[PDB]
Design a protein around this ligand. Structure first.
Ligand SMILES: O=C([O-])[C@@H](O)[C@H](O)CO
Length: 400
């Protein structure tokens, strides 16, 4: 389930890394292949061969050495040779080297990044409406681009047999069978069209259906599709604890948006149960549920489903206090205002030091003199925000 990215430059390495991290990977750029070891392998390793303007033989040697070093410490999973979307550099030498080191029958070259305006049509790269050779990316200063044809570029440095699969054929349900056919026939480099990001999803699904893991070759688009397909477990060390008593439509939508995530757990508070005699045992249960979510790296959303409001706010205050004593969390989000005040009071707070605001409607700071110490606390009034407000709060806590 491990990924190796071998990129030919600084920005390519970073861009691949970012994409992996965004999809839940533990990912690092390792500066010298000589500091690679088994513990660094989970989930992704990125090597920058800094070889775009190097001699072809040097580029080849570095690329192969990166793959070999990863293999030598037990790397197993997927290898992506990150190339320039605009086809600058030692493409053929580096792809051939990576394929040799990978020791599998084929490389899938799916170079497009449609969300960045790079597509592959009939084997040629187009950038924002022009063939690549009618763009700037092709006028030196260091590394000319003499063809928009991926095959033609490759052939400057490698004579490995190639085949192109154009868009209509790419989109067929039998793509994996076609990849297998070409492999069996001795084709080594398979060059695939792409117009939209879904095409890259489809190509990676086909790659995953083969009895070996092909070498992958592409730019940000393919890297993102690979990262997505790995389905990395989303977790955070210090997750948000959210406590929401708001029954507004927008609160439901905000929670629903977070609920879509695999790293979010809801603890639902049946208002009816508050009047039952076993209320305390149920609260103990809800406390346990929240602890289990938070300690296993899920954000935890506690939400309900005159004096009624006060009964509910008091209960949520006591549940929150119970969870804090039982413990984390990375942050505390309280909504609406009645909940914010009831919870603050239950935690012994004397005030709220305001540092700023998230998403134009979520004040944040620290409670003063409370049992949550310097845990960031966020509040939101009932009715405020948009469908992504709570997602914005999750991101805030993830980043700090
Ligand atoms: O693929 C791209 O366009 C970028 O990663 C570029 O190669 C960075 O120099």
């Amino acid at each position: 389930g491990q990924v190796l990215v071998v990129a030919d430059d600084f920005t390519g390495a970073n861009d691949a890394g970012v994409g992996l991290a965004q999809h839940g990977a533990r990912v690092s750029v390792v500066f010298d292949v000589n500091t690679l070891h088994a513990d660094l392998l989970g989930d992704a390793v990125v090597i920058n061969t800094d070889s775009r303007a190097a001699r072809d033989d040097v580029a080849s040697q570095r690329t192969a050495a990166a793959v070999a070093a990863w293999q030598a410490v037990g790397g197993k999973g997927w290898i992506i040779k990150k190339i320039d979307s605009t086809l600058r550099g030692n493409l053929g030498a580096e792809v051939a080297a990576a394929l040799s080191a990978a020791d599998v029958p084929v490389a899938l070259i799916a170079a497009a990044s449609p969300t960045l305006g790079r597509v592959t049509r009939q084997g040629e790269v187009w950038v924002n409406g022009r063939r690549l050779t009618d763009t700037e990316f092709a006028s030196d200063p260091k590394t000319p681009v003499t063809s928009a044809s991926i095959a033609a570029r490759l052939a400057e440095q490698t004579a490995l047999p190639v085949a192109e699969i154009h868009l209509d054929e790419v989109r067929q349900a039998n793509l994996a069978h076609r990849l297998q056919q070409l492999a069996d026939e001795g084709t080594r480099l398979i060059i695939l069209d792409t117009d939209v990001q879904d095409d890259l999803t489809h190509i990676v699904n086909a790659a995953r259906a083969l009895p070996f893991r092909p070498l992958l070759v592409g730019s940000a688009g393919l890297s993102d599709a690979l990262a997505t397909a790995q389905d990395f477990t989303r977790k955070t060390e210090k997750p948000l604890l959210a406590v929401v008593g708001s029954m507004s439509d927008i609160a439901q939508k905000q929670i629903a948006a977070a609920r879509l995530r695999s790293d979010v757990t809801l603890v639902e508070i049946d208002i009816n149960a508050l009047f039952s005699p076993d209320s305390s045992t149920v609260m103990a249960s809800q406390c346990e549920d929240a602890l289990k979510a938070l300690t296993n790296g899920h954000h935890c959303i506690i939400r309900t489903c005159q004096q009624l409001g006060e009964t509910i706010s008091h209960y949520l205050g006591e549940l929150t206090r119970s969870i804090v004593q039982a413990l984390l969390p990375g942050g505390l989000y309280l909504s609406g205002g009645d909940i914010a005040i009831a919870v603050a009071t239950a935690l012994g707070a004397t005030g709220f030091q305001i540092k700023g605001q998230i998403a134009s409607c979520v004040p944040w700071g620290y409670l003063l003199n409370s049992i949550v110490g310097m845990t960031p606390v966020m509040t939101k009034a009932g009715g405020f925000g948009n469908e992504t407000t709570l997602l914005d709060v999750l991101r805030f806590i993830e980043e700090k």
